Design a protein around this ligand. Structure first.
Ligand code: SF4
Ligand SMILES: [Zn+2]
Lengths: 320, 55, 134, 675
DNA sequence: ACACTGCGAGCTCGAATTC
DNA sequence: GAATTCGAGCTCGCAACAATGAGCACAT
């Protein structure tokens, strides 16, 4: 019931639909109006609500009063969520039945043994001149387009391309996605691309040993068909959400596999990156700290001189 | 003007009936030359007749 | 069996193409109807594809040759009284149809002017970004 | 195995049923109790045959008065022998479960060239000659002087059959074609006339299509057989093309001058009735006069009958008995051979077809030949359009008729072309322990160039290279056999020759040998036995052929013969022939089938039949690429059946050539491992 | 007496942090 | 409490659609 094929949705036995299809608060199409008139008058049994942590929002919790069901199972992966509405979920669905021991499934081989690491980068002296000058939101660009953070992503890509690892570079703040993925000539799922070239970039990444990295931007924050990465270089994601950095971890465990987290030190992003490991340390995950990499100053890393470092400050600060 | 457009379709039917006759050469027992030149004469039976259609 | 003249007849030009019991003696070529094509039933009376084949009773069409193609494809034709009976069934009254067309006919000229301000705000952003910085 | 369908006790001859195959018998029982027809679809050839025969043979035990006879129409003689051998396997299973004998006999019918014992008449090659050499030895004037019992020419098998082969029937024991000759040998009877006599008292009867669909045949073998029977049209995806070619005659100058010789040699025999010879000499003049024109192509299906009475003044009332009296005139003349008079019967069959059948027919005289402005070979076609004028006796005479195949592409076109109303119209899909088929639509090339086999996108080298770069890069990752169907012979010849002038065919011959299927039968069967030998040893072969050819409809590619099946374009017919351009006019007014939607339906049933010829069994896996951009659209990939469409995902929908190999290589690696 | 399948537009949400 | 950034989904309009080849089984 996802409004593209609609394989006779009225009169069936298993209906697989979405949120904001069942709780679409505006005027519906005519094909959707006949199915919602059918779905509102038939009692079900065992609704399955995937991604349970989005139910306590204002729109998605009106679903449970539109459709009548006896049993309501909720399957998720990360139960934590900001704004304190998971205690709200104990009566919308029911009590918490089972929680998987995350260190026990790792020790039995059902989940890849993840080596967490939080490599933090010093700030360039030309960039810290403007980071402490202003407070009004332009400094979010200044810590994600750090030239010394660029050298830690280009080195970590090269360190695993020489080991035939499959790299996913998760990076929000889409201006930093362009100026990272065209200075290394790598494909990127920008977010407003398409449905077509979203697929062909996603499948040459899996069954081809030539394309090795991919630069997603806030798309893989759900249960998508991301094709089994081996490392994950997360660069400057959303602010203080421990839901997201347990969904980026799920891309890795699907030391065998291990993911990174680039942090420009002595900024606001150090406070954020310890608020997002606040959930993963409650599953036994150990987050190392890498201060200096394994010989970063000896390969052909970009942003070497200062004249090529001064141009980036004239590009980032020019936005405003 | 049809003749020069029909003199080419024979000219690589002679060199595409060779590839099956050479494809049996790479295998085992070769094909008899009286049968491979049978349909080739039949394919040339129209091309030579149309050769006088615009001679 | 007919309804306009009530005569008993086996078959006519109608009731095998549109299911309408009307004899072929008068046939009303410019009196009761015309033959409206499919593309005129979408932009004049404003019906989607969920109105000609899903609203009960579903009406059928007549395939014919394309006039300016002659080798390409089809040209569907609908009966004109079946369309204006469907437009009164889908859109309330007849005085709701044209009143809904006024807010729709301005949406294309709204697109004509809103294309001309994003062409201003993008080409001026390429030159203002070079003078705001220092 | 006392398997239970909803009302029966079906004795199944196996141990494991598939969960789709048990639901096949429920829908098959839903036809017979409703006393109506049915359009079913199930992929395999075997397993479908043993499940259909398990229900209906068990159905006539619980209700022996509702159905009595099962007529099984198969395509040709190899499948006739296959169905009978699956029937005695079910019969011998009944012999173990009960320990008894049964009043149950099952036959198989074919031509006189198959059931034949007499030595001077069997080694004749062509089928139309063995009827004549029979007819010189068994006609009612040949046996007229055998009432004296002298040493005149006679068949000893026919003259023995009518004296003793009437009082006793065949007892039991399901008969093949070879078993009927063995019964006729050791008893001394005819095998052909014993099968025709005992076809009225049987329970399963397996013959071809043409004993039931051909109107001038079915009134001779199957007119009085059963008013409460069950007909099964097995593998009837092209059931409409059999119904058109049965009621369509074709006349040319090569046939008509041979009718002048037949009318010459009849004039020498009457002097040794006469108004009938001046009748045909009048009619032969008019058909030659209409072929004498060099003008535009024209069509006139009942207006031929007006102009036949204008210059020639022959009405249509004696023309209906034209083929009737010619069958009687040759009887009273006592002609020895009848294969020589085959053009004059073909002219007389044309005369009795334009007099009665004129609602959805046409007559197309084509003086301008194919592609050439002046070649003196005109030809008139009497082409049938309406494919439901041949099953209208079959849809009415019997109780229930079940049209089953593996590739009925939409299930709603077949009750629209053929004027009937089924009661189920159901489809099915096989269930598997793996995913034994990986369809893919290899669209754009390796440099984002379209691959299509259109008419304007055939002579550019940017497409011929991308076809050559595809067959090269699939012949290095597929083991032991690739079948590459092209769309025509003039396109297969003009692409392999254009791969040889470039450097592409030398790199395919390094991997696999390539064998080409040609129009003649001797070079094809030679090139087919070296193909099946090059897949058994380690060389690996490629059989590149055409789509409406002999290998695409007859040869069944079992596992490790054709692991991949490459469709090099959508196999359309010639869409600008004057016969097809008239049939779509009838298909547009009647039944309102859109003219673009019929060419795709006709093409997706040949592109799914030959692709579906790669999986026959439980352990058979097989690749099936569709190397055309036009396969990707909705009105074409939505036509290929529901057992090859449920595995065609959206990732394998517009794959490029190099990405199509790493779905080919990953699939063949997964399939090679044990269960 | 023209016009199929794809596709960016508004519209309205969400998560989390801002102003 | 009312904005943002970037994501998601569902309606719906917009513009322009296509379709090229070749032969043996069955009746007196
Ligand atoms: S009558 Fe019998 S033996 Fe004679 S040709 Fe016919 S089938 Fe053969
Ligand atoms: Zn009337």
């Amino acid at each position: 019931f996802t409004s593209d094929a609609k394989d006779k949705p009225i009169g069936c036995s298993v209906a697989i639909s979405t949120y904001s299809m069942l709780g679409h608060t505006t005027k519906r199409s005519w094909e959707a109006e006949r199915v919602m008139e059918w779905l509102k008058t038939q009692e079900w049994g065992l609704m399955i609500l995937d991604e349970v942590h989005t139910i306590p929002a204002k729109m998605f919790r009106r679903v449970l009063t539109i459709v009548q069901a006896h049993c309501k199972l909720g399957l998720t992966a990360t139960l934590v969520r900001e704004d304190d509405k998971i205690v709200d979920l104990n009566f919308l669905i029911g009590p918490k039945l089972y929680e998987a021991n995350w260190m026990e499934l790792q020790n039995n081989g059902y989940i890849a043994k993840v080596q967490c690491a939080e490599v933090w980068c010093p700030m360039s002296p030309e960039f810290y001149r403007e980071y402490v000058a202003i407070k009004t939101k332009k400094r979010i660009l200044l810590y994600t387009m750090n030239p010394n953070k660029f050298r830690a992503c280009q080195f970590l890509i090269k360190f695993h391309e020489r080991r035939n690892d499959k790299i996913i570079v998760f990076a929000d703040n889409v201006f930093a996605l362009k100026e990272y993925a065209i200075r290394l000539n790598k494909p990127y799922i920008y977010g407003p691309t398409s449905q077509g070239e979203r697929m062909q970039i996603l499948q040459n990444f899996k069954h081809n040993p030539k394309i090795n990295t991919i630069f997603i931007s806030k798309v893989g924050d759900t249960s998508f068909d991301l094709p089994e990465a081996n490392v994950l270089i997360q660069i400057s994601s959303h602010g203080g959400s421990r839901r997201q950095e347990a969904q980026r971890l799920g891309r890795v465990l699907r030391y065998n596999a291990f993911f990174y987290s680039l942090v420009s030190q002595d900024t606001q992003e150090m406070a954020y990156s310890t608020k997002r490991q606040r959930f993963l340390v409650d599953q036994g995950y150990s987050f190392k700290v890498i201060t200096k990499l394994a010989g970063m100053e000896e390969e052909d890393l970009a942003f070497s001189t200062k004249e090529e470092q001064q141009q980036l400050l004239q590009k980032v600060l020019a936005a405003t | 003007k049809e003749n020069s457009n029909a003199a080419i379709i024979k000219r690589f039917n002679h060199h595409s009936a060779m590839v099956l006759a050479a494809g049996l050469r790479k295998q085992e027992a070769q094909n008899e030359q009286t049968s491979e030149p049978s349909n080739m004469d039949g394919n040339s039976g129209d091309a030579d007749c149309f050769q006088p259609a615009v001679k | 069996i007919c309804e306009e003249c009530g005569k008993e007849f086996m078959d006519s030009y109608l009731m095998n193409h549109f299911d309408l019991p009307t004899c072929d003696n008068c046939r009303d070529a410019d009196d009761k109807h015309k033959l409206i094509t499919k593309t005129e039933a979408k932009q004049e009376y404003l019906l989607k594809d969920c109105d000609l084949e899903k609203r009960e009773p579903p009406l059928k069409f007549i395939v014919k040759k394309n006039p300016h193609h002659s080798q390409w494809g089809d040209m569907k034709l609908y009966l004109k009284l079946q369309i204006v009976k469907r437009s009164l069934e889908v859109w309330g009254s007849q005085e709701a149809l044209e009143e809904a067309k006024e807010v729709r006919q301005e949406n294309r000229e709204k697109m004509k002017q809103k294309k001309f301000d994003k062409k201003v705000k993008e080409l001026r952003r390429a030159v203002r970004s070079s003078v705001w910085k220092r | 195995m006392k398997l239970n369908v909803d009302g029966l006790l079906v004795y199944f001859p196996y141990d494991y049923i598939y969960p789709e195959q048990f639901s096949y018998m429920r829908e098959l029982k839903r036809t017979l109790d409703a006393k109506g027809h049915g359009v079913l679809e199930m992929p395999s050839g075997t397993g479908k045959t043993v499940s259909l025969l398990a229900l209906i043979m068990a159905y006539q035990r619980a209700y022996p008065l509702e159905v009595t006879k099962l007529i099984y129409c198969s395509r040709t003689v190899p499948e006739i022998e296959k169905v009978i051998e699956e029937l005695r396997k079910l019969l011998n299973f009944y012999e173990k479960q009960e320990g008894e004998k049964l009043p149950f006999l099952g036959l198989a019918l074919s031509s006189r060239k198959n059931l034949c014992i007499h030595p001077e008449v069997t080694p004749l090659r062509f089928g139309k000659d063995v009827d004549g050499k029979c007819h010189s030895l068994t006609a009612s004037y040949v046996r007229a002087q055998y009432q004296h019992d002298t040493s005149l020419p006679h068949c000893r098998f026919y003259e023995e059959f009518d004296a003793h082969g009437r009082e006793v029937p065949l007892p039991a024991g399901i008969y093949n074609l070879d078993d009927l000759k063995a019964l006729g040998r050791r008893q001394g009877w005819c095998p052909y006339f014993l099968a025709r006599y005992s076809i009225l008292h049987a329970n399963v009867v397996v013959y071809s299509y043409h004993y039931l669909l051909d109107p001038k045949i079915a009134d001779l073998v199957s007119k009085e057989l059963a008013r409460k029977a069950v007909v099964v049209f097995d593998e009837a995806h092209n059931i409409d093309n059999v119904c058109i070619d049965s009621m369509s005659v074709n006349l040319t100058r090569r046939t008509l001058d041979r009718c002048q010789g037949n009318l010459e040699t009849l004039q020498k025999t009457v002097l040794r009735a006469e108004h009938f010879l001046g009748f045909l000499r009048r009619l032969l003049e008019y058909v030659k006069w209409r072929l004498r024109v060099q003008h535009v192509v024209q069509e006139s299906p009942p207006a031929f009958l007006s102009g036949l009475a204008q210059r020639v003044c022959i009405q249509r009332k004696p023309l209906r008995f034209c083929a009737e009296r010619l069958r009687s005139l040759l009887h009273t003349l006592e002609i020895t051979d009848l294969a020589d008079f085959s053009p004059l019967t073909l002219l007389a069959n044309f005369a009795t077809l334009v007099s009665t059948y004129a609602k959805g027919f046409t007559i197309i005289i084509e003086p301008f030949d194919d592609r050439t402005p002046t070649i003196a070979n005109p030809i008139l076609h009497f082409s049938c359009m309406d494919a439901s004028l041949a099953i209208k006796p079959v849809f009415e005479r019997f109780q229930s008729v079940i049209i089953t195949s593996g590739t009925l592409s939409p299930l709603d076109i077949y009750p629209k072309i053929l004027d009937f109303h089924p009661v189920t119209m159901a489809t099915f899909t096989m269930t598997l322990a793996r995913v034994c088929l990986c369809p893919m639509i290899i669209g754009r090339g390796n440099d984002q160039v379209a691959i299509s086999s259109k008419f304007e996108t055939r002579e550019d080298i940017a497409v011929i290279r991308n076809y050559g770069n595809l067959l090269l890069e699939m012949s290095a990752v597929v083991p032991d056999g690739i079948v590459a169907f092209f769309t025509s012979y003039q396109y297969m010849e003009s692409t392999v020759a254009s791969w040889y002038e470039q450097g592409i065919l030398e790199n395919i011959q390094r991997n696999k040998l390539l064998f080409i299927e040609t129009q003649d039968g001797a070079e094809t069967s030679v090139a087919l036995e070296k193909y099946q030998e090059a897949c058994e040893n380690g060389r690996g072969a490629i059989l590149l052929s055409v789509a409406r050819g002999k290998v695409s409809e007859g040869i069944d590619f079992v596992h490790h013969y054709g692991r991949a099946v490459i469709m090099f374009g959508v196999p359309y017919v010639y869409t600008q022939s004057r016969i097809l351009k008239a049939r779509l006019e009838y298909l547009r007014d009647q039944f309102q089938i859109r003219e673009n939607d019929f060419l795709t339906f006709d093409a997706m049933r040949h592109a799914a039949q030959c692709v579906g010829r790669a999986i026959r069994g439980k352990t058979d896996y097989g690749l099936m690429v569709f190397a055309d951009k036009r396969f990707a659209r909705g009105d074409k990939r939505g036509k290929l059946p529901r057992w090859i469409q449920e595995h065609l995902t959206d990732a394998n929908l517009n794959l490029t050539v190099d990405e199509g190999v790493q779905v080919a290589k990953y699939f063949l690696r997964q399939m090679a491992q044990p269960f």
